[PDB]
Each structure stands twice: as structure tokens, then as C-alpha cells.
């Protein structure tokens, strides 16, 4: 149909910016400077593998230097642009025309060619092929301004500028031994020009902030285990009100008469009252094996008017009867909490995911009638279903018993390690870390010399953080909402929250 | 032999404004070397060829000293042989006042170019030492192609692509004679579009779609003087009549309608355009036919030709603001 | 034709003697292939092969469809070294059938012999594509990518073999519930064994940029073999504890079955040595030796090419003490007793100050190649390091005359007090001329020169470094540019070493001198020198190459006067950090930060340097998100709780500061914050709330706490798959709405702009896009500072592209994102 052109040409990279780069050579080199420079744009095209085996470019929209050489807005959280996989190759054509035709025709090539339709001066030739492109499909992240934070002013002027005259003043300012880590850092700074508020604490930001038929419960939580803190001895002002009327009218306000929530509550409530008399400290995951399916939905409400739970300490995340302060007697030492975690990220093998038994249901029937199962308990075999477990359960194992039966208790309860020494407890913890790591691998043999050294000690695969199965069950317990059954204005009205809808209206 | 490249020598020294200070190193009249700018051209022609697929497999330079300097880095980079071919020397009219020069041989040029030149190849034909008018020039290039190729296709049956480094007057007669015109000074098709013979230009002659003798083959011109690899454009074009402009770039996308499978170009394809004036142009790319739609893009697309994939046997950015999206109509 | 009668009357052959008449028919007719075939055939019987291939070549063009005939004459030609004639004959075959895979192999192998590899490589991809399961095609295809330096494409050729070998074994072990015919038809592959792992190790060395990620790939392929693919936990330990006797000291290997221990943990030495060369380019000397110390157990003669390739690497990496242990055994063999052993061995004995031992090994190397003078100039240098100048001058005349012959064709006490006197006047005045004065980039280069002309006087004293100065560091001092060549420099240097002294770089090249005083070396006083190294390190890092200033500080860390003194090793650890921020490389920044946090325990200035250093980028996210950091701060966060809570004797074994003072026993809001960032950055939004909620009890009016809390719920909610998801986003917004109420009310009108954006950015996250633009139109309209406007116009554009409102996305880009 017309003249021919070869396409055996350089196969080159491209960079589809979201910016309106002009034709000037000062405008282009600035857009390369945002993306790290021409030397860092090229090594972004010369990188292979799936995502995060390759990390792309860093578009810094506000790239500019202050007079001191520091990066103005040195915390920009850039826009990341990565190579698009399986790109459809595209040719690029050099359109050539007389000087001044773009200016008189809206600076468009679509119309310029139409203006000089039969001129001999139009020359249109392919010059290369584009097989590779970086483009910025992701979106910009949350941004933080640190211009009036005086610590950033001290960093920026020392580590950013690399000026030695004020670098030296910084390093002579860091105390080799800091005497007050617990306090605000406004006392260690010598700028005193900006007057940060006293309650800001100058916490620096992280590198990536964007990472992509009801009842209100009122259970009590205890946030601090100081020697001053008070423990609840009576339930709560509102639940007793919601529950005292529930005795006379049998509806439990917030529910329909047809749900039988209250009749389910009492048949659960008399169960727990027997249990806390027998064992005053509990985990809810042990109570799931006792209360039937029909009255489990109302257990999260009966615990609130029978029990409280610490958010920290040795008795962390256990339900405790009212009036019972575990720091008052040593008999509450065998009930204190110990956590264990299996690191799948380091034990990523098929040998493990068959030996670790699968978690419990939300609710089940106990093999032990009316009590804790033998499957929560640790006895040197059969990894338990649930790895946060009290000292009262470990003692079935012989070696942990003869450690337990030789302990010396503290006279005053420590805010961590409880009534036990730090020694006699790591002596218990290190054994369990050794035994679980073995039976995950299917060993069950247990060399006695390593297992004997612990018992006579004087002083990682398994780790003592809370397992994710536990954290997922803590949130479902701290959530103040539960199910009873066994567009600026529209979005503002759709929520209808007591707080979320309040402030949302104020800001509009 | 299915493919031919032809290229001009480069930027001489006498073209400098301060004048011809260097002397012919070989001693022959008008055998002037290149300037340092002409050497930077020849390296840029090497890194361009080295970015292609059907790179040349043999180089047939003229014996003149500056055509050897042009092909020296092309030989080192691509690791190819360089043969002298006297039949592609300059066209000297019989009215040269000082002398009609005849260039040097192997023994003189091998001293300046050690190891690069290969002496297997005796010249097929020698220009008339008395000089030759224009009608004698073109028939000489009618004789050259049948005798040259047939001595390539039997001493080197495996070579399918070659490079010729020659001069302007030859480069324009080598093209027209190959394409089969009657005289060289006419235009290619009808539109006054001669062969662009700029300094260190590059042409391309592919065969037009059993093996057949040369004179029955049909060739087409597919580059016509590419100077885009040069950092300075075409400097000193020449055509037989001698005896403002702006550039903008546009992309032509070829999108697939499938999940995670990429279109490709066969590295030997051919492109023809038409209807570029109107809203719906039609492009052929190889055997397939397309129909386009103009679509400006928000933002820009910056392409880096200096970031090309060089093969290698061991400054300029293209600002794009408009695009064409092609759809299958075949 | 009558010849049709005459010829077959002569095809009665039976003794092959009438060939003269066949010679006539090919002259008379000259078109019958029957004549050329037989005339060529009888040449095969008599053995005139060069005449056989000629006739069959003339015969082939007559009947050019019989691609069986082009081949039998092609292979004959390749046997008779007529490659260019053979490639044509193969090329005629492939045109007749493109599905013959023996000719493409034989043709492509001849392209290599010819030099046109691009046509060879094109033959192998298709020959590999249609037969991926033959090793000979694999082995030759991987050579050609290496000839193009396309090594990363040759590794993914041997690795996609491995990934097929794996999926075969996983299917066998699972399909035991045997049908070889059913797994072979589905899982067919090239066997991966110790050999293919050996080649694979060679490619990571020739690649030379993915050192540590390539080691981990060699070990996975080494544990897959030996039947240990289940021991995935070795992928995370840093340093080669497996395949050594150090594996018995691991917490997890000691827990394995009694049966998994007896599997083999031994590499063949040809692969082990390559691992040591990977670790050495990683600048990990220690594990390189632990690989090379395994080279002593093998029989000597079987690994002598590895003693040399290991020592040659240690010598090029400036490890002159470790290399001698691997050169000197080779001298027991005579076939290794030449210059390529001596000359790398002799300079090792020179840098180790064993000059009398190196005097021999130079005097031996010259006997093999007297025409070299790299040895003659160095062997001259040794005669000066020894106190024998009489022979030194006679070696200078010999070498300079030897060079002039080549370019044409192309008082020991009084000796140094007289030098100390004039060098102290030089160094003090050049230092005073540097203080009274000082574009701001040409004033630096003139400054760096007159400081590099001082640091060459201090570092060249040799009583301070237990090793020689780095070539990377002397290269920064040789940048004065007065030199011609690295060897010519020595000659114009050594010529003045004779009796006199004058201005030249490298004063006397190095020399141990009696210090005779502390607090002074020259007129400078050891706190005027240290201020130069640190000020030279930063200035070179700011205006000149950043990688050069880092060599100044790594050299100042080994001076025997600086790291001996505290309050100087403190600064070098910070100055080195300030530069490592500008390297843009992940896994040494962390090595510098963990070096500070161990020394400076519980210090608040350092914990901010930790996180201001890590304020942007994925190179910083991969540090925080790493498990190595999550174990560290947990170890520092249990140590802080031990310092405040324990009434016991135990406050040791981690506590480095004995000065902490917290009578009320408050926590540190920093260690809770840094540690929550690690868990946030690890997508651990449950664990972060366990620690951030402890902050909201302590510092509730802090914005950054109420922001992370609001995002930790919004992000955790989108993980959940129940109706509590909605309650948890509304529980997040309340902590974002008070973040808003704080920044708007209690800060000035620049942080007041932040709070609109980050709220609009939150409604984009949860998809309430119509509300997001409302906040974005506030940062564009209601404020003057324009640094957040182009982040808000960036995210507004994305909203409008999706909504097709490109009419308005063009207005924002031209106004704010223009340039």
C-alpha cells in the first residue's frame, strides 16, 4: 500500500511517567532526577525475577535540595513503579515536519499531519521498538511533615547535609548512657526555636503506612499491675442494670423475646459460677469445651459479670473471678500464663504442618467430662491444640514437675516472672521449647543430657511470643460487640455510629 | 545473500572549518583521514548495528584510508572480517586537475590496520584509472553486483548479510542499480525523494518476498539513510544535483486481548503506513493488517535508546505525548 | 539420447575401472545426477573423498528436493573440514523441512566454528524448545548465552531444570499410594546431579552481583540432592553452618529425627571452593576460609588447581597472609613452580614485611621472564626496605635503561631528623594555608587536594595499620594526577628515594619511624588529624563519589590510635552511618545500625537515628520487616523490663547502661514504637496493637500513635472475613478523626495541611472515594504550601481516570504536576 520500513531495530526501554514533562532538556533531566538519576533508571530495566526480587523506581515528586545540601522533605514516601510483565511491544515513529507547525496547530501531531497532507517535507520513519516499560500504577502513601520537629531538624542538618561542623555537635550530644529513656526527648535537644508541644514525643514515621441484632458488651480490663492499682470486686454499673431488669422482664434489653438470650444466660451463668469456685482462673478456650453450643453466644456476657482479665502481667489474658487478687497469695502461682509460638516462616516444611495438630473449633465437647481436655495439656507428646497454657498444665511432664516441686517462691509478686524466680521459670520454658521443637520434627526421643542440664542449670525454632491463634482470639474477646442469634451525607448516615458518625458530621 | 547494508565513510578532516591540517598517511592524493568527530560517528554506527538482530557477517570496504577507519571499530565490535573491494571506489570525473588518485593495496594499509583486514578477497573489478563519466559509472555498478554476489555466494555460501562501507556517489549508484533504475539521479518512487547519503549514513536492502540467481531477484529499500543513532544528525549529504525542521515522536501500541501473553515483532518484519492524515490510519506490520485510533496519553513516556539491548560476542531521550492503538482487521 | 544407452552399459561396474567413460557422460550431458552420484560413489570406494564430496555437491543441485541427499553430502563435507560448503548443504535441508533436528545441531555447531554465533543461538532455542529434555542441547545452549554475557538467562535455564526435577520427586513421594509410565509421561526432565550444580556455581561467579542470593540457591540444590529438601530452616541461618561440623551446635538440627542426621552433609570440593569465592566477593573472609580449610583433606594432586584459584582470589582481595598458606604447598610440585605462583607469592611476603623471604621469590621470577619489570621495580623496592642502598642504585640503572630501551620502539640517625624537620614544616604550613582560606564545589576540590596531601603523610607511617593500606584508598591519594603510569610513578618515585628528598606523593612509600611522643606525630596532635579523616570522609561523600569517602573512614577505623581511644570510635561509627545512607544498599546499613544499638542501649538519640534513617523506601522496609530486627528489639525490650521490675540479683548479661532511672517504672514509648513499626511493616496488625495500645494509655495526645492505631484497625479489618470488619473500621476512624483534631488545633498551618491529605488518603483506602476528593480539594484550595498538593493531585487523577473524568485530570496535571 505504501513505502516499506524495516523493523529490525533497537529494542529499547520506556518510562511512562504520570507527569507532564515538556520538550525542554532541563525539564526531562529533572524528571530523571526524581527517579534517582539516569544511572538508577537503567538498573531498574536490567532487573529480573518476581516482585521484590525486583524493587522498581522511586518517584520523588518534591525532589529538591536546600542550600545545605540536605533533601528538602527527606521523608517523602515515594511512588513505586515496577516493570509491567508481558508487555505488548510497540514501535515509535519519528515524525518530521517544518519548524513552527506545532505552535500554530494546538501543539498536536494528529492535526499537524492533517495540515500539510500533500507536502514533501513530512518524513515519518520508525526509529526503535519498545519492549520494556516502567509505569506507576500504585498510589501515593500517607505523608508526614517533620519541618517543626526539632529532632528532624538536627538529623537533617547533620546526617543529610553531611556538614561536619554540626555533625560533631550531634555526636557529642548523644549520652553514652542515657539516664531517662522513659521521658520525652525535648530535654536532650538544644535547638529550642520551634517549641514542639510537650505531648508530641517526636515519634518518627515508618517507611510504608499503606500496606494493601447486636449487643454492646462491657467487660472490665485492668491495664496496669502497679502496687497501687485496684482490682474489680463488683461487676459493672451498666451490665448489672441491663441484667437486673433482665430478671424481672425476661428480655435482656437489646434483644427480642424470641431469642431466649436470658434463658440461655442463666443456664450458662450457673455453670461458670461452679467452675470459678473450683478453678478461679481460666482461659476462655478451655471453657469452649464445657458450655454447649446452644448457650455459647451468651458466655462472653456472663464472664463480664463474673470475671475480669488483665491485659498484662504474669496472669496475662486470663479470666479471673471478682475479689481475687493473684498477688495476694502464692497459691495463684500455678495458674500464671505462659505463651509459645511455632515459627512457620522458619519451619516452612511439610514435616511440620502435619505434626502440629489443627486448632479447636469455636466450640466443642470435652473428652474430659466437664473440664479441660487432655489435648490442651502438655505431657511430652502430642503438641497441644492451643499453645498459651498455664503452669498448672505443664506439670504432667516429669522433668517439668521435679523442677516445679523444687522451686523457691518469691515473698512478693514480681510484675514479671510472678511468684517464681526468673531462673526456675526459664528452666521450665527452655524445656518446653526443646520438647516442642523435637515433636514437630517427629522425634519424641529426647536426649537426657541436654534435658538434664536444664534442671541443674544456674544461669530458635520455638518462640514464646503469643501465637497468632491466640491474638485472633483476644480480639474476639475484647470486641465489645457480639451477635445475638445462636455520598458525603449518605455515607455519614449509613454508618450511624455514636462516634464515627459524630465527628464525621463535624467535618462537613 | 538476502540482506545488504551500505554506509558512508564519515566526517573527513578537510570539512573542518579550520581547514585540512592532516596529511594523507598513505601518501596517495586526497586519501585524507577522518576527524575525531568522524571517529565518534563510526563508533555510534557500531553500537547501533550491535543492537540489531541481523547484524552483518562480512564487511567489504573500499581501499581508501577513511573507509577503513570507519569499519575498523565495526569489525572489532562485531568480530567480523574486513575485505577490500576496489570496485566501490569513488567516482572521479576525467577533469580532476591535480591527479585522478588510485588508492593503496593491502601491504600499505595492513601496516596502519594490523590484523583487521583479510587478504583472501581479490577485487572483482577496478575503476577506470583515467577516470569515468557518469554513464560509465552506473554501468560499472551494473556489472559489480552480479560478479560480486556470485563471488560471495561461492567463496562464502554461508554469509547471508553483509556491510559495504563506501562513498556517496557509489552509495547512491549501488542502491539504484540494485533496485533496477535506468539512471541514478532520478528519484525513487515519484516524489523527489532521493537516497539520503549523509555522513556515516546507513541503508538497507532486503529481498522482496528455491534459491535463484541474483539478476532474477527483487530488492527493496527499507532504511534510506538512517542517521538517528548519530548524536548530531546528517551533516554533509550529497546527491548528483550537487556536482528549518522539527522532530516529534509517537508510539504505536499493539495491545493483545488475552491474559498475560505478549505480542511480538519477528525481528525481520516490514511496515507500511497509509491514511496517516485522517482519524483511522491503517498499518501493515509483516503479514498482518491493522487500523489505528489516535489517543493522547495523560503524562509522558520517555524512551532511552542508549539503554538498548546489545548482543555482543564477548544522552538523548525521546519525549512521547501521543499514541496510536492498533486493532486487528485482517 | 544415445548416452542413456552407453552409460548404464558402463554401470555394469563390478570392478570400478570404466570411470573414464562416466567422465565423458558428465561432459556430454552434464545434467544426469546418476552420473555424478556413481562417479562420486566410486571415489568413495577408492578413497578419494575430497573428489567424492565435490561430485555429490554438483549432483545435489540437479534434484533439489531429496533432503536425504543434502545431508549425506553435508556430513561428508564437515568431516573434510569444508564447513562453509557444509552449512549451505544443511541450509538446503532446513528449507525443505524445518522439522529436522539433527541438521540444526550440526549446522549450529559449525556456525560456532565459523564465528557467526547469532545464527547458532537461533538454532538452539528452537532445538531446545521442541526438545527441552536433552542435555547436549542444554549444555551447548548455555555456552552461547555466556558468550553474550547473558549469564542471568543461562542460570534460569539450569534452574527451570531444577524446578522440574523437584516437582518430579514431590509427585513420586505423593504417588506412592508405583506407575513409572504415568509419572514419566507427565514429569519428564533432565537429571539434576552434582555436575549441573558445579556448572551452576561457575555462573554466579561470572555474574558477580548476586553473591548472597546465589549462595542460598547452591545450598538448596545441595540439600535437595542428599534427600534433605525438608530441612528448609537452613535457608535462614546466615553462614554455612550446614556442610560443616558447626551444624551440631544448632538448636533445630539437634531436634531432628535420629534418622535425618546420618544423611550426607558433604559437598564435593569443586563446588565448596566456589562457595568460598562467593563469600569472599561478599567481603566475608571467615566463611571463605572455612570452605578453603576443607581443601586440605583431599589428596594434594587432585585439587592443585583449587589451591591456586583460591589463593589467587585472596591475593586479589588484599588478603596477603591467608594466601601464602595456599601458594606454598604448590611448591612441592614442579609443574606449578613458575612465575604465576611466585609473583603473586612474592608480593604477599612483601606486604607481610617478610622481605628477606620475598627477595628470593622475586629473584626466581626474573629468571623466567627477564623482559618483565613489574618484578624488577618491586625487587628494587625490597633492597631499600632492607638497609642495603649500595645494591639499590645498581638495580635502578638496570631497570630504567631497560625501559628506555622499550619506549623508543614502543647517617641513619641524621638521615631522618633532617627529613622530619622539613616534613613537619610542610605539613604544618599546608595546614595553616588550609585554615586561613576555607562556588562551593571548586573550593572543595582545591581543599581535598591540600588535605589528601596531608593524609598521605599520616597513613604512610606503617606503625598504625596491621595491614597495608587499601588500593581503593591510595587510589584516592593518587588522584592528584601528576602521575603518568602506576609503574612509571614508582620509577620517578624511586629515583628520588636514593639519597635526596623532594615533593612527591607517598613520602618514602611507607616507613616505620620512632614516634618519640604521644599527642604529636608531626606538628599536628592526633585530634587535628582525626578531624581531617572525618571531615575528608564527608566532603568526598558530598561532592565527589560517595564510595570513596567510605574508604577514608573504614581506613580510620584501623589506625591503632583511634579505636584504642573511646570518643573516637564513637564518631567513626556515626560518620560511617551517614555515608552508608547514601550507598543505597540494604545489608550494610543494618550492619551499622545494629552496631550502634548494641553499644548505645536504651538511648533515645540513637533510636531516632534508627528510624529517621529508615524513613522511606523499600530498602528500609525490608530491614524493619526482617525477622532479625524483630528478635533484636524484643531482646532490648525484655531487657528494659528487667532493669525496672527485677528485685533480684540478675540485672546483667544484657544490660550495658547501669544509669537508667525510673522510680515510677514507666515504660519507654520509643521501644514500644520502634517495635510496633516492625510488626506493622511485617503485616502484623494484631501484635502492633498489643504495643500501640500501651502507648495510647501513656501518650494519648501524640498524633503518630493515633494514626498507626487508626490504620492498624483499618488494615486488620480488611484481613477479617466476618461482620466485625465494619465495627473495626469505625473503631479506626475515631483514632484518625482525633489525629485530625490534634494537628488542626495544636500545630501550625503546615501540619494542618497534612491532616486533610492523610484523612482523604484513608477514605481512598477503604473505597469511599467521593469523600476522599473532598479532603483533597482542601489541600489544593485552602492552603498555600504546595509540597503536598502534588501528592493530592496525584491521587485525585487516579480517581478521575477510573471515573473517566479525564477532562479534569488534564487540568490538575498541567497545574500541579507540571514541571
mmCIF file of N, CA and C in Angstrom, chain C residues 564-633:
data_model
loop_
_atom_site.group_PDB
_atom_site.id
_atom_site.type_symbol
_atom_site.label_atom_id
_atom_site.label_comp_id
_atom_site.label_asym_id
_atom_site.label_seq_id
_atom_site.Cartn_x
_atom_site.Cartn_y
_atom_site.Cartn_z
ATOM 1 N N UNK C 564 41.647 2.536 69.671
ATOM 2 C CA UNK C 564 42.122 2.350 71.033
ATOM 3 C C UNK C 564 41.469 3.330 71.995
ATOM 4 N N UNK C 565 41.171 4.546 71.534
ATOM 5 C CA UNK C 565 40.583 5.580 72.369
ATOM 6 C C UNK C 565 39.077 5.596 72.171
ATOM 7 N N UNK C 566 38.249 5.545 73.214
ATOM 8 C CA UNK C 566 36.837 5.875 73.017
ATOM 9 C C UNK C 566 36.675 7.361 72.740
ATOM 10 N N UNK C 567 35.437 7.738 72.407
ATOM 11 C CA UNK C 567 35.071 9.073 71.931
ATOM 12 C C UNK C 567 35.666 9.395 70.562
ATOM 13 N N UNK C 568 36.269 8.406 69.901
ATOM 14 C CA UNK C 568 36.685 8.499 68.510
ATOM 15 C C UNK C 568 36.126 7.346 67.702
ATOM 16 N N UNK C 569 36.106 6.153 68.295
ATOM 17 C CA UNK C 569 35.391 5.036 67.694
ATOM 18 C C UNK C 569 33.890 5.273 67.743
ATOM 19 N N UNK C 570 33.427 6.173 68.612
ATOM 20 C CA UNK C 570 32.024 6.561 68.571
ATOM 21 C C UNK C 570 31.717 7.321 67.291
ATOM 22 N N UNK C 571 32.545 8.312 66.956
ATOM 23 C CA UNK C 571 32.248 9.155 65.806
ATOM 24 C C UNK C 571 32.374 8.386 64.502
ATOM 25 N N UNK C 572 33.388 7.529 64.390
ATOM 26 C CA UNK C 572 33.585 6.789 63.151
ATOM 27 C C UNK C 572 32.415 5.859 62.868
ATOM 28 N N UNK C 573 31.704 5.435 63.912
ATOM 29 C CA UNK C 573 30.524 4.606 63.713
ATOM 30 C C UNK C 573 29.338 5.434 63.238
ATOM 31 N N UNK C 574 29.307 6.723 63.581
ATOM 32 C CA UNK C 574 28.272 7.613 63.064
ATOM 33 C C UNK C 574 28.627 8.151 61.686
ATOM 34 N N UNK C 575 29.870 8.600 61.503
ATOM 35 C CA UNK C 575 30.309 9.095 60.203
ATOM 36 C C UNK C 575 30.148 8.019 59.143
ATOM 37 N N UNK C 576 30.406 6.768 59.508
ATOM 38 C CA UNK C 576 30.243 5.681 58.556
ATOM 39 C C UNK C 576 28.771 5.424 58.276
ATOM 40 N N UNK C 577 27.907 5.675 59.259
ATOM 41 C CA UNK C 577 26.475 5.530 59.038
ATOM 42 C C UNK C 577 25.962 6.598 58.087
ATOM 43 N N UNK C 578 26.369 7.851 58.308
ATOM 44 C CA UNK C 578 25.921 8.962 57.472
ATOM 45 C C UNK C 578 26.230 8.721 56.002
ATOM 46 N N UNK C 579 27.315 8.008 55.723
ATOM 47 C CA UNK C 579 27.710 7.709 54.356
ATOM 48 C C UNK C 579 26.954 6.499 53.829
ATOM 49 N N UNK C 580 26.727 5.499 54.680
ATOM 50 C CA UNK C 580 26.035 4.290 54.249
ATOM 51 C C UNK C 580 24.588 4.587 53.878
ATOM 52 N N UNK C 581 24.019 5.670 54.407
ATOM 53 C CA UNK C 581 22.695 6.098 53.974
ATOM 54 C C UNK C 581 22.676 6.417 52.487
ATOM 55 N N UNK C 582 23.812 6.846 51.945
ATOM 56 C CA UNK C 582 23.920 7.291 50.566
ATOM 57 C C UNK C 582 24.482 6.224 49.631
ATOM 58 N N UNK C 583 24.798 5.032 50.144
ATOM 59 C CA UNK C 583 25.191 3.925 49.285
ATOM 60 C C UNK C 583 24.019 3.349 48.510
ATOM 61 N N UNK C 584 22.811 3.435 49.060
ATOM 62 C CA UNK C 584 21.638 2.755 48.516
ATOM 63 C C UNK C 584 21.897 1.255 48.392
ATOM 64 N N UNK C 585 22.247 0.640 49.521
ATOM 65 C CA UNK C 585 22.343 -0.813 49.617
ATOM 66 C C UNK C 585 21.881 -1.239 51.002
ATOM 67 N N UNK C 586 21.116 -2.328 51.052
ATOM 68 C CA UNK C 586 20.381 -2.679 52.260
ATOM 69 C C UNK C 586 21.288 -3.262 53.335
ATOM 70 N N UNK C 587 22.045 -4.302 52.992
ATOM 71 C CA UNK C 587 22.575 -5.205 54.007
ATOM 72 C C UNK C 587 23.941 -4.798 54.543
ATOM 73 N N UNK C 588 24.286 -3.512 54.504
ATOM 74 C CA UNK C 588 25.348 -2.969 55.340
ATOM 75 C C UNK C 588 24.883 -1.813 56.205
ATOM 76 N N UNK C 589 23.849 -1.090 55.774
ATOM 77 C CA UNK C 589 23.158 -0.166 56.664
ATOM 78 C C UNK C 589 22.737 -0.859 57.949
ATOM 79 N N UNK C 590 22.102 -2.024 57.831
ATOM 80 C CA UNK C 590 21.696 -2.772 59.010
ATOM 81 C C UNK C 590 22.892 -3.188 59.851
ATOM 82 N N UNK C 591 24.028 -3.469 59.214
ATOM 83 C CA UNK C 591 25.221 -3.836 59.964
ATOM 84 C C UNK C 591 25.756 -2.663 60.767
ATOM 85 N N UNK C 592 25.494 -1.439 60.312
ATOM 86 C CA UNK C 592 25.937 -0.257 61.036
ATOM 87 C C UNK C 592 24.955 0.110 62.138
ATOM 88 N N UNK C 593 23.661 -0.087 61.892
ATOM 89 C CA UNK C 593 22.658 0.258 62.891
ATOM 90 C C UNK C 593 22.703 -0.709 64.064
ATOM 91 N N UNK C 594 22.831 -2.004 63.779
ATOM 92 C CA UNK C 594 22.962 -2.982 64.852
ATOM 93 C C UNK C 594 24.278 -2.819 65.602
ATOM 94 N N UNK C 595 25.264 -2.160 64.993
ATOM 95 C CA UNK C 595 26.496 -1.864 65.698
ATOM 96 C C UNK C 595 26.358 -0.728 66.689
ATOM 97 N N UNK C 596 25.412 0.180 66.449
ATOM 98 C CA UNK C 596 25.175 1.291 67.365
ATOM 99 C C UNK C 596 24.241 0.881 68.493
ATOM 100 N N UNK C 597 23.188 0.139 68.163
ATOM 101 C CA UNK C 597 22.176 -0.211 69.148
ATOM 102 C C UNK C 597 22.719 -1.157 70.209
ATOM 103 N N UNK C 598 23.757 -1.927 69.879
ATOM 104 C CA UNK C 598 24.405 -2.768 70.879
ATOM 105 C C UNK C 598 25.252 -1.946 71.839
ATOM 106 N N UNK C 599 25.965 -0.943 71.330
ATOM 107 C CA UNK C 599 26.746 -0.065 72.190
ATOM 108 C C UNK C 599 25.841 0.878 72.969
ATOM 109 N N UNK C 600 24.971 1.592 72.267
ATOM 110 C CA UNK C 600 24.093 2.588 72.875
ATOM 111 C C UNK C 600 22.736 1.974 73.200
ATOM 112 N N UNK C 601 22.657 1.429 74.407
ATOM 113 C CA UNK C 601 21.458 0.733 74.836
ATOM 114 C C UNK C 601 20.495 1.702 75.504
ATOM 115 N N UNK C 602 19.243 1.674 75.056
ATOM 116 C CA UNK C 602 18.140 2.456 75.604
ATOM 117 C C UNK C 602 18.298 3.949 75.365
ATOM 118 N N UNK C 603 19.221 4.355 74.501
ATOM 119 C CA UNK C 603 19.470 5.766 74.258
ATOM 120 C C UNK C 603 18.451 6.269 73.248
ATOM 121 N N UNK C 604 17.934 7.473 73.476
ATOM 122 C CA UNK C 604 16.817 7.962 72.681
ATOM 123 C C UNK C 604 17.290 8.639 71.404
ATOM 124 N N UNK C 605 18.493 9.210 71.414
ATOM 125 C CA UNK C 605 19.006 9.841 70.207
ATOM 126 C C UNK C 605 19.302 8.815 69.128
ATOM 127 N N UNK C 606 19.693 7.607 69.523
ATOM 128 C CA UNK C 606 20.066 6.583 68.558
ATOM 129 C C UNK C 606 18.831 5.916 67.973
ATOM 130 N N UNK C 607 17.794 5.731 68.786
ATOM 131 C CA UNK C 607 16.561 5.127 68.304
ATOM 132 C C UNK C 607 15.863 5.995 67.273
ATOM 133 N N UNK C 608 16.078 7.305 67.321
ATOM 134 C CA UNK C 608 15.572 8.190 66.283
ATOM 135 C C UNK C 608 16.460 8.170 65.047
ATOM 136 N N UNK C 609 17.776 8.083 65.237
ATOM 137 C CA UNK C 609 18.672 7.879 64.105
ATOM 138 C C UNK C 609 18.337 6.577 63.396
ATOM 139 N N UNK C 610 17.881 5.579 64.149
ATOM 140 C CA UNK C 610 17.462 4.323 63.545
ATOM 141 C C UNK C 610 16.315 4.540 62.573
ATOM 142 N N UNK C 611 15.307 5.306 62.984
ATOM 143 C CA UNK C 611 14.071 5.382 62.221
ATOM 144 C C UNK C 611 14.017 6.581 61.287
ATOM 145 N N UNK C 612 14.777 7.646 61.552
ATOM 146 C CA UNK C 612 14.914 8.684 60.539
ATOM 147 C C UNK C 612 15.767 8.201 59.379
ATOM 148 N N UNK C 613 16.734 7.331 59.654
ATOM 149 C CA UNK C 613 17.475 6.660 58.598
ATOM 150 C C UNK C 613 16.590 5.757 57.758
ATOM 151 N N UNK C 614 15.536 5.204 58.351
ATOM 152 C CA UNK C 614 14.648 4.256 57.698
ATOM 153 C C UNK C 614 13.287 4.866 57.406
ATOM 154 N N UNK C 615 13.253 6.124 56.982
ATOM 155 C CA UNK C 615 12.020 6.882 56.842
ATOM 156 C C UNK C 615 11.366 6.732 55.477
ATOM 157 N N UNK C 616 12.015 6.072 54.521
ATOM 158 C CA UNK C 616 11.437 5.940 53.194
ATOM 159 C C UNK C 616 12.137 4.831 52.426
ATOM 160 N N UNK C 617 11.390 4.223 51.511
ATOM 161 C CA UNK C 617 11.938 3.301 50.550
ATOM 162 C C UNK C 617 11.713 1.846 50.918
ATOM 163 N N UNK C 618 11.766 0.944 49.929
ATOM 164 C CA UNK C 618 11.672 -0.485 50.254
ATOM 165 C C UNK C 618 12.968 -1.064 50.785
ATOM 166 N N UNK C 619 14.106 -0.429 50.504
ATOM 167 C CA UNK C 619 15.363 -0.848 51.105
ATOM 168 C C UNK C 619 15.341 -0.713 52.619
ATOM 169 N N UNK C 620 14.522 0.191 53.145
ATOM 170 C CA UNK C 620 14.328 0.371 54.575
ATOM 171 C C UNK C 620 13.194 -0.481 55.120
ATOM 172 N N UNK C 621 12.170 -0.735 54.306
ATOM 173 C CA UNK C 621 11.080 -1.608 54.720
ATOM 174 C C UNK C 621 11.556 -3.041 54.891
ATOM 175 N N UNK C 622 12.503 -3.474 54.063
ATOM 176 C CA UNK C 622 12.982 -4.847 54.150
ATOM 177 C C UNK C 622 13.861 -5.050 55.372
ATOM 178 N N UNK C 623 14.421 -3.971 55.910
ATOM 179 C CA UNK C 623 15.161 -4.047 57.163
ATOM 180 C C UNK C 623 14.205 -4.194 58.337
ATOM 181 N N UNK C 624 13.234 -3.290 58.432
ATOM 182 C CA UNK C 624 12.279 -3.327 59.528
ATOM 183 C C UNK C 624 11.435 -4.592 59.487
ATOM 184 N N UNK C 625 10.967 -4.978 58.303
ATOM 185 C CA UNK C 625 10.148 -6.173 58.165
ATOM 186 C C UNK C 625 10.927 -7.463 58.374
ATOM 187 N N UNK C 626 12.250 -7.402 58.467
ATOM 188 C CA UNK C 626 13.053 -8.595 58.673
ATOM 189 C C UNK C 626 12.847 -9.152 60.073
ATOM 190 N N UNK C 627 12.920 -10.478 60.175
ATOM 191 C CA UNK C 627 12.836 -11.141 61.469
ATOM 192 C C UNK C 627 14.058 -10.875 62.336
ATOM 193 N N UNK C 628 15.189 -10.511 61.734
ATOM 194 C CA UNK C 628 16.399 -10.268 62.510
ATOM 195 C C UNK C 628 16.225 -9.046 63.398
ATOM 196 N N UNK C 629 15.508 -8.032 62.912
ATOM 197 C CA UNK C 629 15.271 -6.845 63.722
ATOM 198 C C UNK C 629 14.190 -7.104 64.762
ATOM 199 N N UNK C 630 13.225 -7.959 64.434
ATOM 200 C CA UNK C 630 12.142 -8.252 65.362
ATOM 201 C C UNK C 630 12.640 -9.042 66.566
ATOM 202 N N UNK C 631 13.732 -9.789 66.405
ATOM 203 C CA UNK C 631 14.321 -10.510 67.528
ATOM 204 C C UNK C 631 15.209 -9.590 68.355
ATOM 205 N N UNK C 632 15.822 -8.604 67.702
ATOM 206 C CA UNK C 632 16.746 -7.709 68.385
ATOM 207 C C UNK C 632 16.022 -6.807 69.373
ATOM 208 N N UNK C 633 15.020 -6.064 68.902
ATOM 209 C CA UNK C 633 14.349 -5.108 69.771
ATOM 210 C C UNK C 633 13.512 -5.801 70.827
#
